[PDB]
Amino acid sequence: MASMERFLSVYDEVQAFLLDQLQSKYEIDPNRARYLRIMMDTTCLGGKYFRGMTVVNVAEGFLAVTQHDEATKERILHDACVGGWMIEFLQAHYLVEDDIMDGSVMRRGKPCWYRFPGVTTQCAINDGIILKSWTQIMAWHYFADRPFLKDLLCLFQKVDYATAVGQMYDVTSMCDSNKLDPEVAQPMTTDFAEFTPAIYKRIVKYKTTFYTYLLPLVMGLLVSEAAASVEMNLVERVAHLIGEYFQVQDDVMDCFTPPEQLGKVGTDIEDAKCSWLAVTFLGKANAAQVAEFKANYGEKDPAKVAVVKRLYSKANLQADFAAYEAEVVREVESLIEQLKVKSPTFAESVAVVWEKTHKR
Ligand X SMILES: NC(=O)CN1C[C@H](O)[C@H]2C[C@@H]1Cc1c2[nH]c2ccccc12
* 254 is known to lie in a ligand binding site: yes
Distance CA 350, CA 200 (A): 24
State the angle between helix axes of 232-256 and 215-224 in degrees (0 to 180), rounded to the nearest 10.
140
Q: Does 254 bind Zn ion (CB under 5 A)?
A: yes
Shortest separation between residue 283's beta carbon and ligand X, angstroms:
21
Name which position in 9, 72, 121, 313 contacts a copy of itself (CB under 8 A).
121
Widest distance between CA atoms in the chain: 68
Shortest separation between residue 253's beta carbon and a copy of itself, angstroms:
23
Q: Does 188 bind ligand X (CB under 6 A)?
A: yes
By beta-carbon proximity to ligand X, the closer residue of 38 and 175 is: 175
What's the gap between Cα 28 and its chain centre?
Answer: 31
By beta-carbon proximity to a copy of itself, the closer residue of 78 and 132 is: 132
Q: 3-class SS at 183?
A: coil
By beta-carbon proximity to Zn ion, the closer residue of 74 and 102 is: 102
By beta-carbon proximity to a copy of itself, the closer residue of 172 and 229 is: 172
Position closest to Zn ion via CB = 98
The residues with which 110 forms a beta bridge, in sequence order, are 107
By beta-carbon proximity to a copy of itself, the closer residue of 182 and 258 is: 182
Count residues contacting a copy of itself (CB under 8 A)? 61
List of residues 6+ apart from 264 with CB closer than 8 A: 104, 105, 106, 107
* 236 is known to lie in a ligand binding site: yes
Q: Which of residues 199-238 bind a copy of itself (CB under 8 A)?
A: 202, 206
By beta-carbon proximity to Zn ion, the closer residue of 127 and 254 is: 254
Distance CA 206, CA 197 (A): 14
List of residues 6+ apart from 216 with CB closer than 8 A: 51, 52, 54, 55, 58, 84, 87
What is the DSSP track for 245-283?
Answer: HHHHHHHHHHHHS-HHHHTS---TTTTT---HHHHHHHH
Q: What does residue 258 show for φ and ψ, rounded to 5 degrees? A: -55, 145
Count residues contacting ligand X (CB under 6 A)? 8
Distance CA 324, CA 333 (A): 14
* 102 is known to lie in a ligand binding site: yes
Q: Residue 111: enclosing H or E segment and its boundaries?
A: strand 110-111
Shortest separation between residue 153's beta carbon and a copy of itself, angstroms:
7
Name which position in 55, 119, 174, 279 contacts a copy of itself (CB under 8 A).
119
Name which position in 272, 311, 328, 347 contacts ligand X (CB under 6 A).
272
Question: What residues form the annotated binding site for Mg(2+)?
Answer: 98, 102, 170, 250, 254
Contact positions toward ligand X, by CB under 6 A?
174-175, 186, 188, 271-272, 298, 300
Question: What residues form the annotated binding site?
Answer: 98, 102, 170, 236, 250, 254, 268
Question: What residues form the annotated binding site for Zn(2+)?
Answer: 98, 102, 170, 236, 250, 254, 268
